[PDB]
Amino acid sequence: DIRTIEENKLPSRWSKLWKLHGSINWQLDKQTQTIWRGTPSKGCSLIHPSHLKYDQSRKMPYLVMMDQLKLFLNQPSAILITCGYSYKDQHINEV
Amino acid sequence: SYYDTTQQLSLLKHVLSEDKRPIAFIIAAGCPVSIRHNDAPLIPDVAGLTRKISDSFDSLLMKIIQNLKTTIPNPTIEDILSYIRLLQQIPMSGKIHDVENSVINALEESICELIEEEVNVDLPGNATPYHKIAAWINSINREHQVEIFTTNYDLLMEQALEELNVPYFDGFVGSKRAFFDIRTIEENKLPSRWSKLWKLHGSINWQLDKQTQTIWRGTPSKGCSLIHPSHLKYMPYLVMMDQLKLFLNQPSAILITCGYSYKDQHINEVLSQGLQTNPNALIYGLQYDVLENYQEAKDMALKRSNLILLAKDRAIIGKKEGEWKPLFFKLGDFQHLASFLEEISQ
Amino acid sequence: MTEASTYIGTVQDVNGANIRVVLDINTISSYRIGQIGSFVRIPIGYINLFGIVSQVGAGAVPDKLLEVEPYGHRWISVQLVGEEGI
Amino acid sequence: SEIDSTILSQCGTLFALRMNNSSDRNHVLGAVSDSFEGLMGMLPTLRTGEAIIIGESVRLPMRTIISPPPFGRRPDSLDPDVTAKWSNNRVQGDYKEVL
Amino acid sequence: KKEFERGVSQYPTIGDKVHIVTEPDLKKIYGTQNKKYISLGNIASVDSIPALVNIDTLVTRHSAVLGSTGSGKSTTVTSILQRISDMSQFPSARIIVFD
Numbered sequence: 001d002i003r004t005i006e007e008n009k010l011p012s013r014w015s016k017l018w019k020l021h022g023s024i025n026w027q028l029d030k031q032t033q034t035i036w037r038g039t040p041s042k043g044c045s046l047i048h049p050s051h052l053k054y055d056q057s058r059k060m061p062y063l064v065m066m067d068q069l070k071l072f073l074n075q076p077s078a079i080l081i082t083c084g085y086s087y088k089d090q091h092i093n094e095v
Numbered sequence: 096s097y098y099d100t101t102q103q104l105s106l107l108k109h110v111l112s113e114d115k116r117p118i119a120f121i122i123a124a125g126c127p128v129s130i131r132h133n134d135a136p137l138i139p140d141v142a143g144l145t146r147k148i149s150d151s152f153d154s155l156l157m158k159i160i161q162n163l164k165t166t167i168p169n170p171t172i173e174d175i176l177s178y179i180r181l182l183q184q185i186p187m188s189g190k191i192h193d194v195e196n197s198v199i200n201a202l203e204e205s206i207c208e209l210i211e212e213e214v215n216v217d218l219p220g221n222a223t224p225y226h227k228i229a230a231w232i233n234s235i236n237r238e239h240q241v242e243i244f245t246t247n248y249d250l251l252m253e254q255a256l257e258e259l260n261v262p263y264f265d266g267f268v269g270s271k272r273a274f275f276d277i278r279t280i281e282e283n284k285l286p287s288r289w290s291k292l293w294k295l296h297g298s299i300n301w302q303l304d305k306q307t308q309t310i311w312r313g314t315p316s317k318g319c320s321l322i323h324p325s326h327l328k329y330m331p332y333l334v335m336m337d338q339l340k341l342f343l344n345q346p347s348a349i350l351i352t353c354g355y356s357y358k359d360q361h362i363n364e365v366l367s368q369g370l371q372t373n374p375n376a377l378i379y380g381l382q383y384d385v386l387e388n389y390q391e392a393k394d395m396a397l398k399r400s401n402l403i404l405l406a407k408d409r410a411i412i413g414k415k416e417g418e419w420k421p422l423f424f425k426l427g428d429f430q431h432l433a434s435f436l437e438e439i440s441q
Numbered sequence: 442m443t444e445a446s447t448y449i450g451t452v453q454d455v456n457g458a459n460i461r462v463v464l465d466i467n468t469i470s471s472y473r474i475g476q477i478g479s480f481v482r483i484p485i486g487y488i489n490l491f492g493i494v495s496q497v498g499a500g501a502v503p504d505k506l507l508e509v510e511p512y513g514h515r516w517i518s519v520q521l522v523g524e525e526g527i
Numbered sequence: 528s529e530i531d532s533t534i535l536s537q538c539g540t541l542f543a544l545r546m547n548n549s550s551d552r553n554h555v556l557g558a559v560s561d562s563f564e565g566l567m568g569m570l571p572t573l574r575t576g577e578a579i580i581i582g583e584s585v586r587l588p589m590r591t592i593i594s595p596p597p598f599g600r601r602p603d604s605l606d607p608d609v610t611a612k613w614s615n616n617r618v619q620g621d622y623k624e625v626l
Numbered sequence: 627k628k629e630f631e632r633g634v635s636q637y638p639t640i641g642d643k644v645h646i647v648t649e650p651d652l653k654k655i656y657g658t659q660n661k662k663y664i665s666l667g668n669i670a671s672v673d674s675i676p677a678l679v680n681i682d683t684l685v686t687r688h689s690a691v692l693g694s695t696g697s698g699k700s701t702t703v704t705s706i707l708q709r710i711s712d713m714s715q716f717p718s719a720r721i722i723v724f725d
Contacts, residue, residue, distance in 0.1 A: 057364045090329060099673050105487075108527070112487045457568025521572045535690065539683055542702065544693020555692060575698050577670060584683040586632070589656060591667040591677040593702045594709070602700040 005064060018065045020092075022046045026061070033059045070095055098410055099420040107379065108439055116347045117239040120228075123246050125354020125383065129429035132219050138249060144172045144210070151209065155192050156202075162191075171358075172210075173324040179203045180326065208318050210248070211299050215315075218254040224433030225255030231440040232290060233261045242291040242342060246359075248299050248322055252292060262289040266331070267312045275310045280334060293335055295362070297321050325361070336365055343369030343376055351379040353432055357392045370399040380404040383427035386411070449475060450517075452483070454503060460492060460519040461501055481519055488526070492519040528554045540582030545573040561588055630655045649674060666709060681710065 010016070026037050026046035033056040035046060049062050058064060073080070073095075087093060111118070127138035139147065149156075163170055163178055179199055182188040189196025218225070232241055245252055256263055266280055267273040279285075301312050301321035310321070310331065325332055342348065343366070357363060357380075370376055378401070380392060386406035396404045396411040404411050407422040425431045444465065454461035462481075466474060475481060475494050483490040496518035499507065503516075528550040535558045543559075546552045552570050556562065561581055566588060573579070576595070581588040647655075649672050656675055665676035691706075693699045711719040 054361070054364075057361075057368060097674065102673050105527075109486045457565070458570075458572040459568070523572075537688060538690040539687030540689045542689075542691040542693070544691070544697040544699055544702065546692070547694050547696075551692070551694075573697070575696070576701070578667075578693075578702060580666075580677070580679060582683075583687055584680040584689075585678075586630075586658065587656070589677055590670045592670060592673075593667045593705050596701065596705045596708055602704050 002058060002064065005068065016068075018068060020062070020065050020069075022049050022061065032056070035059065035061060066091075066095065096417055097420050098412065098417045100424050103405070103410075103424075104426070104435075110349060110377075111436075111439060114235065114237040114239070116349055117241075117342070117345055118237075119242045119244065119342060119348070119350045121244050121246075121350065121352035121355055122252065123352065123355040125356065126224070126429040127247060127249065127251060129354070129383075130219075130223060132216065137216055137219075138214065138247075138251075141171050141173075144213075145170065147213070148172065148175075148206065148209070155194055155198070158192050176203070176206075176322070177324060180323070184327070204318055207320055207322060210322060211315065211318075211320050214249045214299055216249070218251055218258075221258065223251075223255060224429055225251055226258060227433045227437040227440075229256045229259050229261060231436045232256075233259075234440045238287060240287050240290055242293065244339060245292070245294050246296040246355075247294075248297065250298065250300065256290075256292070263292060264289045265292050265294070265312075266335075269311075271313075273312045275312070275331065277334060280338065293338065295332070295335060295339070297323055297331075336361070340365055340369055344373050346373070346375055348373070348376050349379070350377070351381065353381050354383070354429055355380070356382075357389050357395075363391055363395065367395060367399060370401055374401060376401060378402045381427050381432065382406050383429075385409075386416075447472070447482075449481065458521050460521065461503065462517050462519055464515040464517065475517055480522075483519075488524055490521060490524050492521045494518070495520045530554075532558060538582075540580065540584045543570060543579040543581065544577075545575070546570050563588055566590060629658075664709070666706065 004010075023037070024045045024047065025040045026035055027041045027044050028035050028046060033052065035049075049060060052060055054060065054063075110116070124138075124140050128136050128140045128143075130137050136143070159175065159178065160170065163174060167174065179202075182191065182199060183203075187196070189199070192199075243252065264285065266275060268276045268279060298312070299320055299322065300315045301310065302316050302319050303321050304311055343350065366378065370378065380396075380403060382389060382392070382405065384407060386393070386404070386409040389404070389406070392404050393411065393416075396402050397414055400414055405424060405427070407424060407427055409416065409418050410424070411417065426435060448465065450462045450465040452460055453463050460483075473479070475497070477494055477497060479494055481492050481494065483492060494517055498516075499514050501516040501518035502514055528548075532554070535554075538558075541555070541559060543555055546555065555570075556567060559567075559581055566579060569579070569590070574592075577590065577592055579588065579590050652669065652672065652675055656669060656678065658678055660680075662682055663678035663680050666679045667677040669675040669677060691699055691703055693702075707721060707723070710716065711721055
């Protein structure tokens with residue numbers, strides 16, 4: 001689901017978890033770009049999603065997570081804590 | 096099953112005569128081909144550039160063409176340029192064509208030099224359609240200024256808009272180096288009088304200075320250009336497409352495409368996303384050809400309701416294909432559209 | 442900006458071909474303001490609707506407004522004549 | 528306003544074009560049996576060609592634009608052209624033959 | 627989902643939402659599947675709609691055309707007579723004009 005990210009209407013007690021680099025249970029669909037999450041497929045997984053030509057734009061979980069981080073940072077917050085980051089990624093550093 | 100031209104033109108004239116609605120434009124490669132300077136066209140279309148490259152350059156060129164055609168239809172200049180840059184991404188890429196590399200790096204420079212020398216054609220006298228469009232731009236003191244998007248590598252828009260001195264802003268700020276700015280793009284805190292012109296596919300005066308990896312515009316150097324369609328640098332393209340997407344989200348926005356063939360892929364997808372996000376957006380697709388030659392446009396029209404596609408013989412409106420009431424609708428031609436704009440200006 | 446030159450009022454009643462306009466010019470009374478035989482121009486988006494004044498004063502006020510406030514008469518009655526094409 | 532009311536009242540369908548004066552409009556409104564106040568106020572300002580078809584031959588009183596006949600054949604009386612004839616130079620006449 | 631029939635069944639109450647009629651709705655209203663009705667023109671609002679007019683009631687009941695001389699009533703009558711007397715559709719027409 002994509003739109004419910006943008007309306008951002010979620011329970012206050014509910015937390016949000018985003019996986020920037022992907023997971024080992026994500027699996028794409030041959031028919032169309034789906035990237036559905038379920039039981040870990042035998043051998044098939046989405047690791048480091050960087051080769052999709054942005055086909056079916058906004059369906060890539062990378063861009064939506066990046067935009068979520070950007071919109072959170074643009075919010076007039078006052079706290080952000082990082083741990084274990086090696087600062088070896090240019091895309092995260094630039095944003 | 097039937098449509099009449101007069102009512103469509105009347106509706107369009109009603110639309111263009113409102114200053115509350117923001118207005119934009121898309122000036123693709125189909126506009127320059129509509130003006131003749133010499134016996135030959137002033138600027139050939141993409142097929143013209145492909146033919147000129149084919150007959151001007153040989154064995155490795157044909158090998159590359161065969162390799163790309165093995166899985167793709169008739170190519171364009173963008174396709175071969177992207178293939179060349181993708182090969183340049185891999186260091187030891189010279190074994191694919193058995194050329195040992197270091198030759199493609201010069202072939203691409205030769206192609207860039209040929210294209211940059213061919214596209215520099217200068218504008219003819221003050222009777223050009225672009226002059227009429229520029230005159231129409233500043234004719235009315237609209238409260239929302241009109242933005243212009245161009246996929247052309249040339250500078251006809253610049254010459255035409257400067258011949259009738261009008262407010263202008265393309266993102267670059269400066270006088271000697273004209274350093275590209277990003278912040279001033281994002282706050283959008285500019286006076287309403289200043290017009291906005293944006294080149295999605297890059298110009299010919301853009302030079303990559305390397306070194307500090309910075310971009311700057313200005314005088315066109317020899318051989319060094321930034322003609323890149325999209326490129327994959329580690330950027331103006333992404334932020335400028337974001338600007339287009341942000342514009343399409345404005346309430347009651349009108350966008351007119353002239354001479355656009357809809358053959359691009361990212362542009363079509365961002366247009367579809369903008370149309371689906373805000374139902375109040377409205378896009379006038381103007382073509383000069385048989386409607387059967389635009390399959391992607393037909394799919395978009397059948398998918399997005401608020402997209403109006405008008406062709407010479409047939410027209411599809413509101414997910415319902417039809418035909419003109421007794422070719423018609425000469426508004427697809429750039430000259431006729433310019434005459435229409437200049438007559439509605441007064 | 443504000444109402445430019447050659448401004449009179451706004452349409453406040455339509456009965457097909459009998460327009461009633463409320464005057465906005467306070468005390469101009471001097472091209473003179475709309476007389477009986479004068480013409481007025483009503484632009485709709487692109488085309489201008491030309492009309493002729495027919496009633497000025499208490500004759501143009503709606504019936505219920507007179508019953509409510511019978512001391513203020515700033516209304517004119519316009520009858521449409523034709524339109525300017527393209 | 529001249530046609531007998533007892534005759535105009537028996538006509539099933541009326542094609543009300545633009546009527547300028549007030550007697551004709553009143554006489555027409557008094558002889559119609561399916562009146563919509565929205566459309567009956569539109570009579571003085573109908574375009575040259577528009578019609579308001581009212582009566583038993585239509586489901587609803589509709590405001591139409593009658594399809595024009597093809598160009599090259601339109602009703603036109605061949606009355607003498609005053610300006611063209613008066614603009615010509617005067618030639619000598621033979622009034623003996625007229626007698 | 628049958629058709630458009632004159633006369634309502636239950637009236638609206640306070641707060642009911644009021645919408646605007648779109649072109650397909652107009653086609654539903656001003657359209658019919660009967661074979662007697664004949665298109666004579668187009669509605670003024672949108673030109674894609676045909677103005678269906680019955681022909682049995684037009685002739686059998688009666689007709690009448692009223693309008694000013696500057697409204698071009700002659701062209702309307704000529705178009706109506708030409709449309710009724712089409713050779714391909716009505717090969718056995720019968721009309722007398724008292725010009």
